[PDB]
């Protein structure tokens, strides 16, 4: 029985990056070369170990994290980067050895007049830790004045809408992203290549 990669890669809608989804894959056969060749991807960068060689290992669990960011932000989805997306939305560890896959989704996630349903976190007191996920919605205090939960001067709502439009330049268009991470425990290793 084949691993259910399709319900992640071919999902009708994706999550806002601040509210990124994780899918656990287990108990199945996974062809990472035939997934390389599922379709045409704009980015498919595997850190550490090749895909053809991934087909010869086994793991306890593989995790598929997915979300939407701007094309120019995909370079932040890599170990050791910074910027608003790595700092406040989705963070990979320096020692990451999984894969990052991305493709242009202008046709699906942009709307005339702006798709305002995809958001990112713009303000945060501190940086995320690797694989942290912060769906908090508390008003951010930019100054000395307390905020008490009301927006105003120096008191900002922390999430910002991308407003994806079909006519944005390519660097600004929506990109769907999938991050593969590979977990091996002291337990049976049940996801393997054929």
């Amino acid at each position: 029985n084949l691993c259910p990669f399709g319900e992640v890669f071919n999902a009708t809608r994706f999550a806002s990056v601040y509210a990124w989804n994780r899918k656990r894959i287990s108990n199945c056969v996974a062809d990472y070369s035939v997934l390389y060749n599922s379709a045409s991807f704009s980015t498919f960068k595997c850190y550490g170990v090749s895909p053809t060689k991934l087909n010869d290992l086994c793991f306890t669990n593989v995790y598929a994290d997915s979300f939407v960011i701007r094309g120019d932000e995909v370079r932040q989805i890599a170990p050791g980067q910074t910027g608003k997306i790595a700092d406040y939305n989705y963070k990979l560890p320096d020692d990451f050895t999984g894969c990052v896959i991305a493709w242009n989704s202008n046709n699906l996630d942009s709307k005339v007049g702006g798709n305002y349903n995809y958001l990112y976190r713009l303000f945060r007191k501190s940086n995320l830790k690797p694989f942290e996920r912060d769906i908090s919605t508390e008003i951010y205090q930019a100054g000395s004045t307390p905020c008490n939960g009301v927006e105003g001067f120096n008191c900002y709502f922390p999430l910002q809408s991308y407003g994806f439009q079909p006519t944005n330049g390519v660097g600004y268009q929506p990109y769907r992203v999938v991050v593969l991470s590979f977990e091996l425990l002291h337990a049976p290793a049940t996801v393997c290549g054929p």
Partner: antibody
Amino acid sequence: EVQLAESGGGLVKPGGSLRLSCVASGFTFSSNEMHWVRQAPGKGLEWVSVISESGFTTEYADSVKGRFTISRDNAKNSLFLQMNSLRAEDTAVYYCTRVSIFGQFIVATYFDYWGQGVLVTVSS
Amino acid sequence: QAALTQPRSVSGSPGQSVTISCTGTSSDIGGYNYVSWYQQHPGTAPKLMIYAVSERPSGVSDRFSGSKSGNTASLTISGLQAEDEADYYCCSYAGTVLFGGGTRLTVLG
């Protein structure tokens, strides 16, 4: 006046490599998305590749994906196209052309200026 | 086959009018105004003649005009002159570059 000055064409055997370059003058290069478009003899314009202003986003036609790499050097006002594993059917004139990006939007006057075009011939 | 469909050949006598059509879909020509037209003489780069469906750059003859209806754009050239003989390409770049296949315009002699 806006100018795009191309160089680097020529004759190469199938399997070989070439690097095309396009040097921009007369406009703020880092505010422009840049594209390569090619035209095989007697045929239409075929879009090939795009790079965003920052250089962080690149896309390719299926016909060249995996073999061509677009890149830019904003501090040198330069756009490049690295062409590897060339095949007969890549024989064409290659043009660079700009798309100004204003307020994150494509301007209505996209491809308003083009390079002069360089011939790439893949033959043995 | 090109993404946008144009006729291969159009022609008219000197002084007359001619129109070149460009058919796409509701998600390019039908849905957006990023419709441009390019002129190409043998041996030279494309030159922008019409943009935003109907607007012309300074220096382009006002004998060139553009319009659209439904999913079809039209380039019209009135008062034909010998120097108009050329290939013409329509394009739509509403987020994805879509070129027409090109029309050869002949000015009949």
